[PDB]
Design a binder for this molecule. Structure first.
Ligand SMILES: CCCCCS(=O)(=O)c1cccc(C(=O)N[C@@H](Cc2ccccc2)[C@H](O)CN[C@@H](C)C(=O)NC2CCCCC2)c1
Length: 372
């Protein structure tokens, strides 16, 4: 009953229905493995269809403490409190959890996105104001018998968040696991990067400067400057049969082709090799251009199919965002401190190429690829 419990619009996040308060107030909540605060609009905003009304909830408790949260994109401030929370299309339980009532925000809420709040599913260590503010999923596990694990299948868009388990109907082939290096973000280690089978030939610590995270709340694949520049150079070379403006590669400008004629074949596959659970072993996940060229829906341009380049530069480490997670089933195995990847039942791919998760691979170089 949890399958297909996510919705979204491309590039605007995936959200699950939740209720807060007594009696329950229904809100759509963005699922974010890249943060650890549960926060909801709690005052009028031009882009909010509805918001949390604390005065109507008998079970609301004010914590008399403000909080401020800056993201890569956007920021908000609010008042901390606790209240009862449920997930209608998740486990059938009710938990009391911390909630940040957003009273002011800047470039956070998105016009027409259909969500009114955000569920930070990462660890207390990056919670604001500090790590003593217990994250929602921690409260969920403490207060119920739900297993300490959840999985995400991100595919108008939809998908599934399976809480407490793994649904075999959502993937094919094998699940490969990479260790969670540190429990704050869902931090992982990338050991090798190839573009159309060609190694970028970098010291592997560069791939994880200064960290690499799995982040459902970030749209793009974000790469450290040095890695980004090398990637773009190789993708340009592979697709050189056509030339695009530098603004396209900066992720700022659209590229369009006549409807139905996108030249997928001139764009390379990208392989990210992730540290395995055994010494010097790895597996790779392979991303097709259908993933890193993000379609931008606009009726005005609909004579064409237009895309944004959904790989962009980072100064804060690698971010494996939605572009990467789409077409994979991703298991956040908190209990065993590992992340699993498998090919998703909802894959794009064409008649020539298919996204993959495969291994094992062995590395002779004994260097630790972690930055710290
Ligand atoms: C021209 C290129 C544009 C690229 C846009 S893009 O793809 O980066 C990009 C595109 C869309 C969103 C974001 C983005 O910052 N995502 C937020 C959540 C969010 C979701 C929806 C709207 C606004 C925000 C994550 O939480 C980001 N996760 C960590 C990286 C993070 O910043 N964690 C915080 C650490 C400090 C405490 C709070 C959590 C980035």
């Amino acid at each position: 009953e949890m399958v297909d419990n996510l919705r979204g619009k491309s590039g605007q996040g995936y959200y699950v229905e939740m209720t807060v308060g007594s009696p329950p107030q229904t809100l759509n909540i963005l699922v974010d493995t890249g943060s650890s605060n549960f926060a909801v609009g709690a005052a009028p905003h031009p882009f909010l269809h509805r918001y949390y009304q604390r005065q109507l909830s008998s079970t609301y408790r004010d914590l008399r403490k403000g909080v401020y949260v800056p993201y890569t994109q956007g920021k908000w401030e609010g008042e901390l409190g606790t209240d009862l929370v449920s997930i209608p299309h998740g486990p059938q339980v009710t938990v009391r959890a911390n909630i940040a009532a957003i009273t002011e925000s800047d470039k956070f809420f998105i016009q027409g996105s259909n969500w009114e709040g955000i569920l930070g599913l990462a660890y207390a260590e990056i919670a604001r104001p500090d790590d003593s503010l217990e994250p929602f999923f921690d409260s969920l596990v403490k207060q119920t018998h739900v297993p300490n694990l959840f999985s995400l299948q991100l595919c108008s868009v939809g998908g599934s968040m399976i809480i407490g388990g793994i649904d075999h109907s959502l993937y094919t082939g094998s699940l490969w696991y990479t260790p969670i290096r540190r429990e704050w973000y869902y931090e992982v280690i990338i050991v090798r990067v190839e573009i159309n089978g060609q190694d970028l030939k970098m010291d592997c610590k560069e791939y994880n400067y200064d960290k690499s995270i799995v982040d459902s709340g970030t749209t793009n694949l974000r790469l450290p400057k040095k890695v980004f520049e090398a990637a773009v150079k190789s993708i340009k070379a592979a697709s050189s049969t056509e030339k695009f403006p530098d603004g396209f590669w900066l992720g700022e400008q659209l590229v369009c082709w006549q409807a139905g004629t996108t030249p997928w074949n001139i764009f390379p596959v990208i392989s990210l090799y992730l540290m395995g659970e055994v010494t010097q072993q790895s597996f790779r996940i392979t991303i097709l251009p259908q993933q890193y060229l993000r379609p931008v829906e606009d009726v005005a341009t609909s004579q064409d199919d237009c895309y944004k380049f959904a790989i962009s530069q980072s100064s804060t480490g690698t971010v494996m965002g939605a572009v990467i997670m789409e077409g994979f089933y991703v298991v956040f195995d908190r209990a065993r401190k590992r992340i699993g990847f498998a090919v998703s039942a909802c894959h794009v791919h064409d008649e020539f190429r298919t996204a993959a998760v495969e291994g094992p691979f062995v590395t002779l170089d004994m260097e630790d690829c972690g930055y710290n």
